[PDB]
A = this chain, B = another copy of it.
Amino acid sequence: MRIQEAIAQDKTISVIIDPSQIGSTEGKPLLSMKCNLYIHEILSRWKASLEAYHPELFLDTKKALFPLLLQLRRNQLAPDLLISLATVLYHLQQPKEINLAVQSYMKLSIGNVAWPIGVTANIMIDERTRLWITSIKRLITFEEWYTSNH
C-alpha cells in the first residue's frame, strides 16, 4: 500500500494537534503530517509579518526546515523524536502556554523525550536532527511575538 502518499494529499486534515494522539503508534502517520502542515502554517504567518518580525532570518529558517518537513511528510521521523516535536508544537498552539513550549523544547534540546504538560527518557540526536531543532526555536520566538502583537 501507499498510505503516506494518500495522507500527504488528504485535504480533510487540519493543522490542529490533539494531545491525546501524541504517543499513539497507529496515529503516528497522521500526527507526522499534522506537524508538517502546522510548521508550514507558522512560516506562512511569519511571511505575512516580514515587515514586522526579523525579515532577515525568514528565508534561512525556512530553508533549514525543508529536510525536516520532507521527513514529516514521509513519516520518516523516529517515534520519540516525533513525540517531542509534537509536544512542543501542541503547547505552541495553546493560549498562554509559551513557557510550556519552551520547557518541552529544552527537553528535546538535550536529548530527552518531551510529553505534553497538564493534559492527557533518551533520544538520539545527530547533526541532521540538531539542525532542525535549532531552527524550531525561531518558530517559537516568532509565535511568542505574533501572539503578543495581536
Interface of A with B (CB < 8 Å)?
Answer: 47, 50-52, 55-56, 58-59, 62
Contacts and interface: CB of A to CB of B under 8 A. Distances in A.
Contacts of A50: 47, 50-51, 55, 58
B56 A56 contact: yes
Contacts of A59: 51-52, 55
Nearest to A46: B51
Per DSSP, chain A at the interface is: helix
Nearest to A48: B50
A59 B47 CA distance: 14
Nearest to A52: B59
A47 B56 CA distance: 12
Scoring A52, A59, A62 by chain B CB atoms within 10 A of each residue's CB, the highest score goes to A59
A51 B59 CA distance: 6
Contact of A58 (B47, B55, B58, B62): B55
